[PDB]
Amino acid sequence: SMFKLLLIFADPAEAARTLSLFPFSLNKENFYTYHTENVLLDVMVLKTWGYRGVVQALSPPPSGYDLWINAGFAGAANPNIPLLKTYTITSVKELTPTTSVEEELEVTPIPRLPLAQLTSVRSPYRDGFHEHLQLVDMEGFFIAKQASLVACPCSMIKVSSDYTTREGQDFLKNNKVKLSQKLAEAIFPIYSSFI
Amino acid sequence: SMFKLLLIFADPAEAARTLSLFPFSLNKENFYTYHTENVLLDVMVLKTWGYRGVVQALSPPPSGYDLWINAGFAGAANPNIPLLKTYTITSVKELTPEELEVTPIPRLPLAQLTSVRSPGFHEHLQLVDMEGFFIAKQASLVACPCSMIKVSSDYTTREGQDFLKNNKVKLSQKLAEAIFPIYSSFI
């Protein structure tokens, strides 16, 4: 009767505009809560990027949510992907050598968002395009692993923020507010569908 | 197509949480613009309350919008109106010893509004404000559709007003949470 939603952001800049949507109360550092009659909306901001940040924040993982959403910026490893476009993820993997048996996790799509697949890396991915790759981040695979430990559905909202090239970073640098606002505008309709 | 929406608030406190929803740009004092590919979302904050504020800001009325929304707090002049409830308006009149029809926003509960020119309970009144009637009059001059979002903020009694001053952030947030789905529907 009260939907309990946990939002997870890798970085305060990515979380900024979502945190402006609601008069969140700051519960402990990097953890915000907005508690209404129909919806509990908690926002976790990791302290650092990647597996390390996920581990520090989500082990043991919290039990009791109805859904987790990892929302963040993602690199585009295909130049046909436009930037500033918000996707929902259908499955996520970790980047491994091509010979390695790939481990792919199914993810719960968010309605009304275009679909994409996600690969998480442990070091910045910059050797350009190619080839079984669409969107690239550093947290999503590991968040999904932690969610599976509590049998909690996991969705991801990823906004294309840069191409995975050395030169592609300039766009991220000039557009952080707009990218953060894209995540916010995809999250509000979710909250509102329970309110 | 770009949908051109003018949102009108009577004062900064009522506007605060809606202004927090988007990274608005501010050129003229009291006027905010969020210009995207699909929606032009302008927010006007009146410089003072009531008829005088509406006339200063909207006479002559601005042309070229697709819809005006007046969003604000409203007193409840019948004790069967619960507080903290967000309504959309079906018609508005001015208090007299002639009704303007208003376009209701989807999914919000319906109410009738009376605007007064100065601040107990009455029969025949539901929600009470100070701007809506005069905004609807100005929107008529440009043949612009007008809707209103009003959240019950107090009973129209001497005691009733403590709830308003205790709960300004939450009342402002109710307005924001009703406006964002309108924006979202054009994307």
mmCIF file of C-alpha atoms in Angstrom:
data_model
loop_
_atom_site.group_PDB
_atom_site.id
_atom_site.type_symbol
_atom_site.label_atom_id
_atom_site.label_comp_id
_atom_site.label_asym_id
_atom_site.label_seq_id
_atom_site.Cartn_x
_atom_site.Cartn_y
_atom_site.Cartn_z
ATOM 1 C CA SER A 1 0.000 0.000 0.000
ATOM 2 C CA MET A 2 3.094 2.222 0.223
ATOM 3 C CA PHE A 3 5.496 1.744 -2.703
ATOM 4 C CA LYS A 4 9.109 1.783 -1.495
ATOM 5 C CA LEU A 5 11.572 2.964 -4.126
ATOM 6 C CA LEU A 6 15.359 3.181 -3.770
ATOM 7 C CA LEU A 7 17.169 5.416 -6.265
ATOM 8 C CA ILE A 8 20.934 4.953 -6.620
ATOM 9 C CA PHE A 9 23.233 7.551 -8.198
ATOM 10 C CA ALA A 10 27.005 7.151 -8.613
ATOM 11 C CA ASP A 11 27.829 10.851 -8.156
ATOM 12 C CA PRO A 12 26.226 13.982 -6.602
ATOM 13 C CA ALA A 13 26.315 15.815 -9.949
ATOM 14 C CA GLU A 14 24.209 13.073 -11.514
ATOM 15 C CA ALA A 15 21.763 13.144 -8.576
ATOM 16 C CA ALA A 16 21.514 16.925 -8.316
ATOM 17 C CA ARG A 17 18.350 17.629 -10.344
ATOM 18 C CA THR A 18 16.469 14.608 -8.990
ATOM 19 C CA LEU A 19 17.266 15.866 -5.475
ATOM 20 C CA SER A 20 15.648 19.201 -6.445
ATOM 21 C CA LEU A 21 12.359 17.488 -7.402
ATOM 22 C CA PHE A 22 11.321 16.858 -3.759
ATOM 23 C CA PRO A 23 11.940 18.424 -0.317
ATOM 24 C CA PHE A 24 14.129 15.511 0.699
ATOM 25 C CA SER A 25 15.379 15.266 4.258
ATOM 26 C CA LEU A 26 19.082 14.397 4.618
ATOM 27 C CA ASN A 27 19.020 11.332 6.857
ATOM 28 C CA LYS A 28 22.690 10.335 7.009
ATOM 29 C CA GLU A 29 25.349 11.680 4.668
ATOM 30 C CA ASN A 30 24.686 10.810 0.979
ATOM 31 C CA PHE A 31 21.260 9.352 1.882
ATOM 32 C CA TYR A 32 18.054 11.341 1.326
ATOM 33 C CA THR A 33 14.448 10.392 2.132
ATOM 34 C CA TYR A 34 11.035 11.622 0.947
ATOM 35 C CA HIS A 35 8.222 9.863 2.828
ATOM 36 C CA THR A 36 4.576 10.332 1.714
ATOM 37 C CA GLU A 37 1.333 8.386 2.166
ATOM 38 C CA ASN A 38 1.657 6.377 -1.051
ATOM 39 C CA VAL A 39 5.402 6.390 -1.838
ATOM 40 C CA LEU A 40 8.668 6.144 0.051
ATOM 41 C CA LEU A 41 11.385 7.585 -2.166
ATOM 42 C CA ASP A 42 14.955 7.121 -0.863
ATOM 43 C CA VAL A 43 17.996 8.380 -2.771
ATOM 44 C CA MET A 44 21.488 6.974 -2.210
ATOM 45 C CA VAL A 45 24.493 8.783 -3.653
ATOM 46 C CA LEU A 46 27.565 6.547 -3.766
ATOM 47 C CA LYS A 47 30.787 7.905 -2.264
ATOM 48 C CA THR A 48 32.929 6.829 -5.224
ATOM 49 C CA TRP A 49 32.382 5.289 -8.629
ATOM 50 C CA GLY A 50 32.234 1.675 -9.654
ATOM 51 C CA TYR A 51 32.266 -1.657 -7.875
ATOM 52 C CA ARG A 52 34.124 -0.054 -4.951
ATOM 53 C CA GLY A 53 31.374 2.521 -4.393
ATOM 54 C CA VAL A 54 28.598 -0.079 -4.810
ATOM 55 C CA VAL A 55 30.291 -2.382 -2.298
ATOM 56 C CA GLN A 56 30.818 0.359 0.282
ATOM 57 C CA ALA A 57 27.132 1.385 0.105
ATOM 58 C CA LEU A 58 25.098 -1.753 -0.688
ATOM 59 C CA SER A 59 26.684 -4.648 1.308
ATOM 60 C CA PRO A 60 24.672 -5.904 3.028
ATOM 61 C CA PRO A 61 22.052 -4.626 0.599
ATOM 62 C CA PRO A 62 18.979 -3.027 2.177
ATOM 63 C CA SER A 63 15.951 -5.247 2.357
ATOM 64 C CA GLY A 64 12.360 -4.039 2.082
ATOM 65 C CA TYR A 65 12.228 -1.933 -1.069
ATOM 66 C CA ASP A 66 9.792 -2.805 -3.829
ATOM 67 C CA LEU A 67 12.180 -1.574 -6.531
ATOM 68 C CA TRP A 68 15.686 -0.178 -6.962
ATOM 69 C CA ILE A 69 16.529 2.193 -9.814
ATOM 70 C CA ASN A 70 20.160 2.922 -10.716
ATOM 71 C CA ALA A 71 20.016 6.219 -12.592
ATOM 72 C CA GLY A 72 23.125 7.681 -14.128
ATOM 73 C CA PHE A 73 25.165 8.949 -17.037
ATOM 74 C CA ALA A 74 26.430 6.418 -19.598
ATOM 75 C CA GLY A 75 28.952 6.482 -22.427
ATOM 76 C CA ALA A 76 27.841 5.591 -25.942
ATOM 77 C CA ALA A 77 30.104 3.042 -27.660
ATOM 78 C CA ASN A 78 28.214 3.349 -30.911
ATOM 79 C CA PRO A 79 28.185 6.690 -32.774
ATOM 80 C CA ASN A 80 24.582 6.041 -33.926
ATOM 81 C CA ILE A 81 23.451 6.641 -30.321
ATOM 82 C CA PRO A 82 22.450 10.291 -29.876
ATOM 83 C CA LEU A 83 23.581 12.037 -26.712
ATOM 84 C CA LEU A 84 21.150 13.510 -24.153
ATOM 85 C CA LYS A 85 18.809 10.547 -24.714
ATOM 86 C CA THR A 86 17.395 8.625 -21.774
ATOM 87 C CA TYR A 87 17.214 4.828 -21.993
ATOM 88 C CA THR A 88 16.023 1.983 -19.826
ATOM 89 C CA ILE A 89 18.200 -1.103 -19.638
ATOM 90 C CA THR A 90 17.064 -4.612 -20.568
ATOM 91 C CA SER A 91 20.218 -6.492 -19.569
ATOM 92 C CA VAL A 92 23.627 -5.713 -18.181
ATOM 93 C CA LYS A 93 27.030 -7.414 -18.355
ATOM 94 C CA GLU A 94 30.593 -6.825 -17.219
ATOM 95 C CA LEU A 95 33.280 -6.205 -19.808
ATOM 96 C CA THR A 96 35.509 -9.217 -20.188
ATOM 97 C CA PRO A 97 37.861 -10.574 -22.845
ATOM 98 C CA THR A 98 36.043 -11.756 -25.983
ATOM 99 C CA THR A 99 36.953 -15.375 -25.234
ATOM 100 C CA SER A 100 35.335 -15.248 -21.796
ATOM 101 C CA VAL A 101 31.937 -16.831 -21.055
ATOM 102 C CA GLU A 102 29.736 -13.762 -20.690
ATOM 103 C CA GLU A 103 27.482 -13.291 -17.628
ATOM 104 C CA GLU A 104 24.406 -11.234 -18.517
ATOM 105 C CA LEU A 105 21.757 -10.185 -15.993
ATOM 106 C CA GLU A 106 18.210 -9.357 -17.000
ATOM 107 C CA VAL A 107 17.038 -5.950 -15.801
ATOM 108 C CA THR A 108 13.478 -4.655 -15.322
ATOM 109 C CA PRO A 109 12.640 -2.101 -18.069
ATOM 110 C CA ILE A 110 11.052 1.197 -17.060
ATOM 111 C CA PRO A 111 7.904 1.901 -19.118
ATOM 112 C CA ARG A 112 7.896 4.569 -21.803
ATOM 113 C CA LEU A 113 11.660 4.696 -22.218
ATOM 114 C CA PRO A 114 13.606 3.367 -25.236
ATOM 115 C CA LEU A 115 15.488 0.161 -24.580
ATOM 116 C CA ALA A 116 19.242 -0.347 -24.481
ATOM 117 C CA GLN A 117 21.792 -2.862 -23.235
ATOM 118 C CA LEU A 118 24.501 -1.900 -20.732
ATOM 119 C CA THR A 119 28.111 -3.001 -20.078
ATOM 120 C CA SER A 120 29.855 -2.032 -16.815
ATOM 121 C CA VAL A 121 33.640 -1.525 -16.789
ATOM 122 C CA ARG A 122 36.134 -1.131 -13.943
ATOM 123 C CA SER A 123 38.385 1.471 -15.621
ATOM 124 C CA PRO A 124 37.346 4.260 -18.002
ATOM 125 C CA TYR A 125 36.483 2.810 -21.413
ATOM 126 C CA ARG A 126 37.984 5.069 -24.108
ATOM 127 C CA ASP A 127 39.404 2.959 -26.938
ATOM 128 C CA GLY A 128 36.533 4.143 -28.995
ATOM 129 C CA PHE A 129 33.735 2.285 -30.595
ATOM 130 C CA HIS A 130 33.155 -1.483 -31.028
ATOM 131 C CA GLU A 131 31.569 -3.843 -31.006
ATOM 132 C CA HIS A 132 28.888 -5.727 -29.093
ATOM 133 C CA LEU A 133 28.494 -2.490 -27.047
ATOM 134 C CA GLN A 134 25.783 0.106 -26.757
ATOM 135 C CA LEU A 135 25.906 1.922 -23.383
ATOM 136 C CA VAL A 136 28.813 1.794 -20.908
ATOM 137 C CA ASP A 137 28.855 2.693 -17.214
ATOM 138 C CA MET A 138 30.663 1.492 -14.079
ATOM 139 C CA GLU A 139 27.979 0.628 -11.501
ATOM 140 C CA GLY A 140 25.007 -1.096 -13.119
ATOM 141 C CA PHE A 141 26.188 -4.704 -13.238
ATOM 142 C CA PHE A 142 27.259 -4.605 -9.593
ATOM 143 C CA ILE A 143 24.057 -2.930 -8.369
ATOM 144 C CA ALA A 144 22.036 -5.649 -10.119
ATOM 145 C CA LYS A 145 24.162 -8.320 -8.365
ATOM 146 C CA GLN A 146 23.436 -6.762 -4.978
ATOM 147 C CA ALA A 147 19.708 -6.482 -5.790
ATOM 148 C CA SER A 148 19.569 -10.166 -6.648
ATOM 149 C CA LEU A 149 20.725 -10.940 -3.062
ATOM 150 C CA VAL A 150 17.489 -9.505 -1.637
ATOM 151 C CA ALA A 151 15.350 -10.676 -4.567
ATOM 152 C CA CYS A 152 14.457 -7.059 -5.332
ATOM 153 C CA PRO A 153 13.554 -5.933 -8.854
ATOM 154 C CA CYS A 154 16.228 -3.662 -10.335
ATOM 155 C CA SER A 155 15.771 -1.097 -13.126
ATOM 156 C CA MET A 156 18.291 1.244 -14.674
ATOM 157 C CA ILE A 157 17.836 4.675 -16.240
ATOM 158 C CA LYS A 158 20.897 5.728 -18.247
ATOM 159 C CA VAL A 159 21.239 8.987 -20.182
ATOM 160 C CA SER A 160 23.789 8.954 -23.020
ATOM 161 C CA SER A 161 26.396 11.457 -21.858
ATOM 162 C CA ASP A 162 29.505 11.068 -24.040
ATOM 163 C CA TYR A 163 30.977 8.851 -26.714
ATOM 164 C CA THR A 164 33.574 6.387 -25.466
ATOM 165 C CA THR A 165 36.514 8.272 -26.987
ATOM 166 C CA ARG A 166 39.147 10.598 -25.538
ATOM 167 C CA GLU A 167 37.494 13.550 -27.293
ATOM 168 C CA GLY A 168 33.964 12.458 -26.294
ATOM 169 C CA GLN A 169 34.377 13.714 -22.728
ATOM 170 C CA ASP A 170 34.076 17.397 -23.655
ATOM 171 C CA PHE A 171 30.331 17.008 -24.048
ATOM 172 C CA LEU A 172 29.864 15.573 -20.570
ATOM 173 C CA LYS A 173 31.840 18.532 -19.180
ATOM 174 C CA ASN A 174 29.616 21.173 -20.836
ATOM 175 C CA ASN A 175 26.241 19.488 -20.198
ATOM 176 C CA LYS A 176 26.149 18.054 -16.640
ATOM 177 C CA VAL A 177 23.065 20.015 -15.543
ATOM 178 C CA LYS A 178 21.056 19.078 -18.635
ATOM 179 C CA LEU A 179 22.049 15.429 -18.314
ATOM 180 C CA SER A 180 21.094 15.390 -14.638
ATOM 181 C CA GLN A 181 17.751 16.966 -15.543
ATOM 182 C CA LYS A 182 17.071 14.180 -18.075
ATOM 183 C CA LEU A 183 17.333 11.639 -15.270
ATOM 184 C CA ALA A 184 15.052 13.764 -13.079
ATOM 185 C CA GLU A 185 12.429 13.997 -15.826
ATOM 186 C CA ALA A 186 12.432 10.231 -16.259
ATOM 187 C CA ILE A 187 12.123 9.620 -12.507
ATOM 188 C CA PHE A 188 9.195 11.947 -11.740
ATOM 189 C CA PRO A 189 6.684 10.028 -13.903
ATOM 190 C CA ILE A 190 7.547 6.885 -11.928
ATOM 191 C CA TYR A 191 6.853 8.530 -8.588
ATOM 192 C CA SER A 192 3.770 10.156 -9.972
ATOM 193 C CA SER A 193 2.322 6.834 -11.182
ATOM 194 C CA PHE A 194 1.864 5.855 -7.498
ATOM 195 C CA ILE A 195 1.018 9.231 -5.939
ATOM 196 C CA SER B 1 5.162 21.192 -32.380
ATOM 197 C CA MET B 2 5.998 23.171 -29.263
ATOM 198 C CA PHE B 3 3.423 23.526 -26.533
ATOM 199 C CA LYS B 4 3.559 26.994 -24.964
ATOM 200 C CA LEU B 5 2.467 26.985 -21.326
ATOM 201 C CA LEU B 6 2.167 29.997 -19.005
ATOM 202 C CA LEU B 7 2.030 29.137 -15.295
ATOM 203 C CA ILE B 8 0.943 31.936 -12.974
ATOM 204 C CA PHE B 9 1.598 32.031 -9.199
ATOM 205 C CA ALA B 10 0.487 34.816 -6.851
ATOM 206 C CA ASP B 11 3.692 34.868 -4.754
ATOM 207 C CA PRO B 12 7.154 33.302 -4.373
ATOM 208 C CA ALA B 13 6.238 30.859 -1.598
ATOM 209 C CA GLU B 14 3.558 29.208 -3.721
ATOM 210 C CA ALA B 15 5.876 29.079 -6.735
ATOM 211 C CA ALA B 16 8.959 27.826 -4.843
ATOM 212 C CA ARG B 17 8.673 24.066 -5.369
ATOM 213 C CA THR B 18 7.570 24.311 -9.004
ATOM 214 C CA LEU B 19 10.586 26.550 -9.685
ATOM 215 C CA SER B 20 12.709 23.777 -8.168
ATOM 216 C CA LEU B 21 11.498 21.213 -10.767
ATOM 217 C CA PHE B 22 13.449 22.653 -13.746
ATOM 218 C CA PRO B 23 16.620 24.654 -14.258
ATOM 219 C CA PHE B 24 14.723 27.800 -15.221
ATOM 220 C CA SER B 25 16.447 30.871 -16.604
ATOM 221 C CA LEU B 26 15.447 34.238 -15.141
ATOM 222 C CA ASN B 27 15.675 37.362 -17.278
ATOM 223 C CA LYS B 28 13.048 39.791 -16.004
ATOM 224 C CA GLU B 29 12.463 39.818 -12.283
ATOM 225 C CA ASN B 30 9.593 37.497 -11.395
ATOM 226 C CA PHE B 31 9.626 35.724 -14.776
ATOM 227 C CA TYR B 32 11.170 32.320 -15.441
ATOM 228 C CA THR B 33 11.563 30.371 -18.702
ATOM 229 C CA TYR B 34 12.347 26.712 -19.409
ATOM 230 C CA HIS B 35 12.641 26.369 -23.178
ATOM 231 C CA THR B 36 12.839 22.811 -24.530
ATOM 232 C CA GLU B 37 12.274 21.164 -27.916
ATOM 233 C CA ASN B 38 8.709 20.170 -27.065
ATOM 234 C CA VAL B 39 7.492 22.552 -24.346
ATOM 235 C CA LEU B 40 7.931 26.221 -23.579
ATOM 236 C CA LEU B 41 7.307 26.430 -19.836
ATOM 237 C CA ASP B 42 7.166 30.034 -18.596
ATOM 238 C CA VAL B 43 6.470 30.843 -14.926
ATOM 239 C CA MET B 44 5.136 34.271 -13.953
ATOM 240 C CA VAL B 45 5.202 35.200 -10.231
ATOM 241 C CA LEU B 46 2.889 38.163 -9.585
ATOM 242 C CA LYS B 47 4.607 41.022 -7.778
ATOM 243 C CA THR B 48 1.687 41.346 -5.318
ATOM 244 C CA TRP B 49 -1.517 39.465 -4.487
ATOM 245 C CA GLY B 50 -5.023 39.800 -5.917
ATOM 246 C CA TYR B 51 -6.584 41.966 -8.571
ATOM 247 C CA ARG B 52 -3.800 44.580 -8.373
ATOM 248 C CA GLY B 53 -1.120 41.980 -8.991
ATOM 249 C CA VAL B 54 -3.033 40.384 -11.852
ATOM 250 C CA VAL B 55 -3.643 43.733 -13.524
ATOM 251 C CA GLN B 56 -0.022 44.841 -13.154
ATOM 252 C CA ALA B 57 1.242 41.590 -14.724
ATOM 253 C CA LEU B 58 -1.393 40.633 -17.318
ATOM 254 C CA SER B 59 -2.931 43.867 -18.604
ATOM 255 C CA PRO B 60 -2.420 43.884 -21.493
ATOM 256 C CA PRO B 61 -2.560 40.092 -21.542
ATOM 257 C CA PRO B 62 0.317 38.280 -23.252
ATOM 258 C CA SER B 63 -0.443 36.719 -26.606
ATOM 259 C CA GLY B 64 0.854 33.464 -28.076
ATOM 260 C CA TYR B 65 0.509 30.843 -25.338
ATOM 261 C CA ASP B 66 -1.411 27.606 -25.805
ATOM 262 C CA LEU B 67 -2.617 27.457 -22.197
ATOM 263 C CA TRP B 68 -2.486 29.486 -18.991
ATOM 264 C CA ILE B 69 -2.455 27.726 -15.616
ATOM 265 C CA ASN B 70 -3.007 29.663 -12.439
ATOM 266 C CA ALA B 71 -1.630 27.551 -9.600
ATOM 267 C CA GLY B 72 -2.060 28.555 -5.974
ATOM 268 C CA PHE B 73 -3.276 28.057 -2.433
ATOM 269 C CA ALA B 74 -6.987 28.422 -1.756
ATOM 270 C CA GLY B 75 -9.038 28.773 1.377
ATOM 271 C CA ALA B 76 -11.852 26.292 2.044
ATOM 272 C CA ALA B 77 -15.098 28.100 2.922
ATOM 273 C CA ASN B 78 -16.948 24.850 3.674
ATOM 274 C CA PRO B 79 -15.592 22.590 6.467
ATOM 275 C CA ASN B 80 -16.299 19.479 4.302
ATOM 276 C CA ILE B 81 -13.375 20.435 2.057
ATOM 277 C CA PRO B 82 -10.342 18.619 3.494
ATOM 278 C CA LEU B 83 -7.083 20.497 3.759
ATOM 279 C CA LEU B 84 -4.003 19.684 1.690
ATOM 280 C CA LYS B 85 -6.114 18.496 -1.273
ATOM 281 C CA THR B 86 -5.200 19.520 -4.812
ATOM 282 C CA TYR B 87 -8.167 20.489 -6.957
ATOM 283 C CA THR B 88 -8.671 21.605 -10.505
ATOM 284 C CA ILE B 89 -11.282 24.336 -11.134
ATOM 285 C CA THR B 90 -14.427 24.068 -13.280
ATOM 286 C CA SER B 91 -15.612 27.674 -12.962
ATOM 287 C CA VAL B 92 -14.725 30.863 -11.140
ATOM 288 C CA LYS B 93 -16.682 33.907 -10.025
ATOM 289 C CA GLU B 94 -16.050 37.038 -7.976
ATOM 290 C CA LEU B 95 -17.716 37.417 -4.589
ATOM 291 C CA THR B 96 -20.813 39.605 -4.749
ATOM 292 C CA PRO B 97 -23.760 40.338 -2.541
ATOM 293 C CA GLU B 98 -21.629 35.732 -13.426
ATOM 294 C CA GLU B 99 -19.429 32.597 -13.739
ATOM 295 C CA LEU B 100 -16.453 32.077 -16.056
ATOM 296 C CA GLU B 101 -15.932 28.482 -17.212
ATOM 297 C CA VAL B 102 -12.389 27.123 -16.694
ATOM 298 C CA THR B 103 -10.777 24.059 -18.331
ATOM 299 C CA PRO B 104 -10.266 21.232 -15.801
ATOM 300 C CA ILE B 105 -6.915 19.484 -15.628
ATOM 301 C CA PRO B 106 -7.209 15.681 -16.112
ATOM 302 C CA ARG B 107 -7.064 13.390 -13.065
ATOM 303 C CA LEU B 108 -7.475 16.134 -10.416
ATOM 304 C CA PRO B 109 -10.692 16.352 -8.345
ATOM 305 C CA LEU B 110 -13.048 19.101 -9.407
ATOM 306 C CA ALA B 111 -14.016 22.243 -7.508
ATOM 307 C CA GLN B 112 -15.571 25.682 -7.994
ATOM 308 C CA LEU B 113 -13.615 28.827 -7.080
ATOM 309 C CA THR B 114 -14.578 32.292 -5.819
ATOM 310 C CA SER B 115 -12.117 35.202 -5.944
ATOM 311 C CA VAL B 116 -12.307 38.036 -3.379
ATOM 312 C CA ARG B 117 -10.753 41.469 -3.358
ATOM 313 C CA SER B 118 -9.951 41.323 0.361
ATOM 314 C CA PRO B 119 -9.471 38.291 2.674
ATOM 315 C CA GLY B 120 -16.001 32.859 8.545
ATOM 316 C CA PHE B 121 -17.540 29.818 6.793
ATOM 317 C CA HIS B 122 -20.237 30.347 4.196
ATOM 318 C CA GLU B 123 -22.741 28.224 2.380
ATOM 319 C CA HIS B 124 -22.581 28.478 -1.432
ATOM 320 C CA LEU B 125 -18.761 28.828 -1.487
ATOM 321 C CA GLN B 126 -16.181 26.110 -1.907
ATOM 322 C CA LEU B 127 -12.583 27.277 -2.549
ATOM 323 C CA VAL B 128 -11.665 30.942 -2.155
ATOM 324 C CA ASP B 129 -8.730 32.814 -3.649
ATOM 325 C CA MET B 130 -7.831 36.353 -4.802
ATOM 326 C CA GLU B 131 -6.479 35.947 -8.372
ATOM 327 C CA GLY B 132 -8.313 33.289 -10.360
ATOM 328 C CA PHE B 133 -11.312 35.260 -11.608
ATOM 329 C CA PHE B 134 -9.155 38.128 -12.798
ATOM 330 C CA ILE B 135 -6.697 35.812 -14.527
ATOM 331 C CA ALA B 136 -9.537 34.072 -16.383
ATOM 332 C CA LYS B 137 -10.813 37.498 -17.439
ATOM 333 C CA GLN B 138 -7.415 38.398 -18.920
ATOM 334 C CA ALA B 139 -7.057 35.028 -20.671
ATOM 335 C CA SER B 140 -10.427 35.708 -22.345
ATOM 336 C CA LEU B 141 -8.998 38.791 -24.061
ATOM 337 C CA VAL B 142 -6.473 36.618 -25.926
ATOM 338 C CA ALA B 143 -8.844 33.648 -26.356
ATOM 339 C CA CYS B 144 -6.290 31.534 -24.441
ATOM 340 C CA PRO B 145 -7.502 28.389 -22.634
ATOM 341 C CA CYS B 146 -7.217 28.818 -18.884
ATOM 342 C CA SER B 147 -7.000 26.117 -16.182
ATOM 343 C CA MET B 148 -6.382 26.428 -12.456
ATOM 344 C CA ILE B 149 -4.750 24.237 -9.817
ATOM 345 C CA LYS B 150 -5.718 25.128 -6.246
ATOM 346 C CA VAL B 151 -4.675 23.265 -3.110
ATOM 347 C CA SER B 152 -6.769 23.761 0.026
ATOM 348 C CA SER B 153 -4.462 25.554 2.474
ATOM 349 C CA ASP B 154 -6.701 26.786 5.341
ATOM 350 C CA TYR B 155 -10.277 27.226 6.417
ATOM 351 C CA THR B 156 -11.659 30.735 5.885
ATOM 352 C CA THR B 157 -11.758 31.431 9.624
ATOM 353 C CA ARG B 158 -9.543 33.253 12.124
ATOM 354 C CA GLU B 159 -8.273 29.940 13.530
ATOM 355 C CA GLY B 160 -7.969 28.267 10.083
ATOM 356 C CA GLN B 161 -4.840 30.169 9.017
ATOM 357 C CA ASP B 162 -2.346 28.398 11.301
ATOM 358 C CA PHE B 163 -2.304 25.475 8.897
ATOM 359 C CA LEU B 164 -1.231 27.729 6.010
ATOM 360 C CA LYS B 165 1.845 29.191 7.773
ATOM 361 C CA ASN B 166 2.825 25.764 9.192
ATOM 362 C CA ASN B 167 2.688 23.948 5.852
ATOM 363 C CA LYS B 168 3.947 26.296 3.120
ATOM 364 C CA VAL B 169 6.565 23.927 1.711
ATOM 365 C CA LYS B 170 4.192 20.979 1.503
ATOM 366 C CA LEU B 171 1.367 23.020 -0.039
ATOM 367 C CA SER B 172 3.828 24.377 -2.622
ATOM 368 C CA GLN B 173 5.026 20.819 -3.347
ATOM 369 C CA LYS B 174 1.457 19.660 -4.006
ATOM 370 C CA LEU B 175 1.218 22.249 -6.766
ATOM 371 C CA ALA B 176 4.577 21.119 -8.181
ATOM 372 C CA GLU B 177 3.510 17.474 -8.185
ATOM 373 C CA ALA B 178 0.348 18.339 -10.131
ATOM 374 C CA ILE B 179 2.189 20.479 -12.689
ATOM 375 C CA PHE B 180 5.019 18.123 -13.598
ATOM 376 C CA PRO B 181 2.718 15.478 -15.197
ATOM 377 C CA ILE B 182 1.306 18.213 -17.434
ATOM 378 C CA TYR B 183 4.823 19.034 -18.620
ATOM 379 C CA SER B 184 5.613 15.382 -18.977
ATOM 380 C CA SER B 185 2.564 14.720 -21.142
ATOM 381 C CA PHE B 186 4.053 16.813 -23.981
ATOM 382 C CA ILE B 187 7.378 14.928 -24.133
#
